[PDB]
Amino acid sequence: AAIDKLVKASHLIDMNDIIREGNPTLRKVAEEVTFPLSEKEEILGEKMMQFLKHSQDPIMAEKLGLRGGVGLAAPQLDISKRIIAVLVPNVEDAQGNPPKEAYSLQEVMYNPKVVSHSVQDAALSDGEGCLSVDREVPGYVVRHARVTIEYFDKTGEKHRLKLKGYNSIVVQHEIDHIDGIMFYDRINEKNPFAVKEGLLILE
Ligand SMILES: O=C(Cc1c[nH]c2ccc(Br)cc12)NO
Ligand SMILES: [Zn+2]
Ligand SMILES: [Zn+2]
Numbered sequence: 001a002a003i004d005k006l007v008k009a010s011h012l013i014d015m016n017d018i019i020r021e022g023n024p025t026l027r028k029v030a031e032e033v034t035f036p037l038s039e040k041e042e043i044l045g046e047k048m049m050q051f052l053k054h055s056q057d058p059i060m061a062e063k064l065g066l067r068g069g070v071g072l073a074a075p076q077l078d079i080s081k082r083i084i085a086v087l088v089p090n091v092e093d094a095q096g097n098p099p100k101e102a103y104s105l106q107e108v109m110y111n112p113k114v115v116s117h118s119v120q121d122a123a124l125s126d127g128e129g130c131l132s133v134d135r136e137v138p139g140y141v142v143r144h145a146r147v148t149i150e151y152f153d154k155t156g157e158k159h160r161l162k163l164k165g166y167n168s169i170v171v172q173h174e175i176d177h178i179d180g181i182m183f184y185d186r187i188n189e190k191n192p193f194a195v196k197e198g199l200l201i202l203e
């Protein structure tokens, strides 16, 4: 199966493992994972985080044919399970010093969900995109500004976490994938750049 291909020790995920727009897997509701995790689900999580680290690494990204990205969901690999990886980097200062924290968020999440959120909405100024979508898609993807999530880590430990800013946007984007929701589902149908008063536009 797909899973068997991905969890081979020597196999590195790359773009040839990512399914495309139109594949029915992207529109399903992914299945909850049960704990204790199987070996395949643990390794899958680890391979997904490795893909993100590679996509961020100029050398590996070039070797494998990836562009920098910040999140990945198991459905995108044709695996209909509630597994996401998120890796949101902080940026160097003007002097070229690395940030005090490499990442604002770095996690492999099992069964993640939004349990509460702000009334306020937010959107990336630059819109969104998708590893599975090879089309230009303009517009503000309207999301919750702030979210409180629950998820489980690979050990089975439950976490409850409030997120804001970019972190909030990324996690929402990935959770959407495990619910069969695409980013453009949340772009205004008639005016992609419509702004409802009070929308937080993140630069
Ligand atoms: O498809 C993706 C990665 C991805 C590519 N372009 C993006 C723009 C904004 C956000 Br949020 C996420 C992405 N994760 O599911
Ligand atoms: Zn592959
Ligand atoms: Zn392991």
Ligand SMILES: [Zn+2]
Binding pocket: 050, 054, 060
């Ligand atoms: Zn590596």
Ligand SMILES: [Zn+2]
Binding pocket: 117
């Ligand atoms: Zn609500």
Ligand SMILES: [Zn+2]
Binding pocket: 129, 130, 131, 173, 174, 177
């Ligand atoms: Zn996506």
Ligand SMILES: [Zn+2]
Binding pocket: 114, 117, 144
């Ligand atoms: Zn919501």
Ligand SMILES: [Zn+2]
Binding pocket: 115, 150
């Ligand atoms: Zn709860």
Ligand SMILES: [Zn+2]
Binding pocket: 184, 185, 187, 188, 189
């Ligand atoms: Zn539309």
